[PDB]
Amino acid sequence: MKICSIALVGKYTKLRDCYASVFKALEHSALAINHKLNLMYIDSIDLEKITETEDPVKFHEAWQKLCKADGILVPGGFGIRGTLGKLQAISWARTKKIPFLGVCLGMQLAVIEFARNCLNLKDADSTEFRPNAPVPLVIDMPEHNPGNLGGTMRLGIRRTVFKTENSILRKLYGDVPFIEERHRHRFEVNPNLIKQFEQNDLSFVGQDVDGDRMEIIELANHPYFVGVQFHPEFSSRPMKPSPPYLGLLLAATGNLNAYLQQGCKLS
């Protein structure tokens, strides 16, 4: 088979049990388009300047892996650790037009990266690990559901509704007006800052049922640059690969338009 190389920019330099569902979703997608998956694991701190100084061999190893990648994935995340590295990975994929998928934290970092470098909102940040942030672009937004005391994390299966008929993800999900996926997050794009994005290339193409939380992003003028707040891994299966992962492997291999034109068989 032809090989597809995908960089997973995360916490470790090898397969850990926290990425098992993620690996399985990529493999379903790979098999479904008759490619062998070569998943390169990159510890995101290695891509940072600090590592160039203290361990340049690791630094150049990380960047070589990132630069040979046909597709780049920033999955759901742990903490403040290696955030700058992930932003650099995202910057690379954006500017070099490499197929990109950001999941939960990876969507949020993608929003922040676009804000800093394409909207010139230089200090745009998440309040999660700096609550006194000047531009609070990503913020703590609990649900307040019936039968509970106080706010809670957005958890379990939820409906995401498409805001437009011109979304590549909508196509890949089989042209339905909404989807149901699993959530585990409390930080959201700040609604006070959404107006800033309207004349620019990053669009919010999916939202929760109430319309307060932006859940899917897509970058125009790029072959495939996608972020989702939910974890699409958890609904992937061999005969129905998770569309966002399928779209990444399709785009990484140069086969996306062909799949659209054959009628999205695997949706």
PDB file of C-alpha atoms in Angstrom, residues 114 119 194-202:
ATOM      1  CA  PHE A 114      -5.721  32.508  14.068  1.00  0.00           C
ATOM      2  CA  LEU A 119      -6.561  39.159  13.309  1.00  0.00           C
ATOM      3  CA  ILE A 194     -17.009  36.291  17.535  1.00  0.00           C
ATOM      4  CA  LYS A 195     -17.766  39.469  15.506  1.00  0.00           C
ATOM      5  CA  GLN A 196     -13.970  39.922  15.071  1.00  0.00           C
ATOM      6  CA  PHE A 197     -13.898  36.818  12.812  1.00  0.00           C
ATOM      7  CA  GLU A 198     -16.625  37.766  10.289  1.00  0.00           C
ATOM      8  CA  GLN A 199     -14.597  39.324   7.449  1.00  0.00           C
ATOM      9  CA  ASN A 200     -11.792  36.766   7.776  1.00  0.00           C
ATOM     10  CA  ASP A 201     -11.143  33.172   6.626  1.00  0.00           C
ATOM     11  CA  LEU A 202     -11.922  31.187   9.822  1.00  0.00           C
TER      12      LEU A 202
END
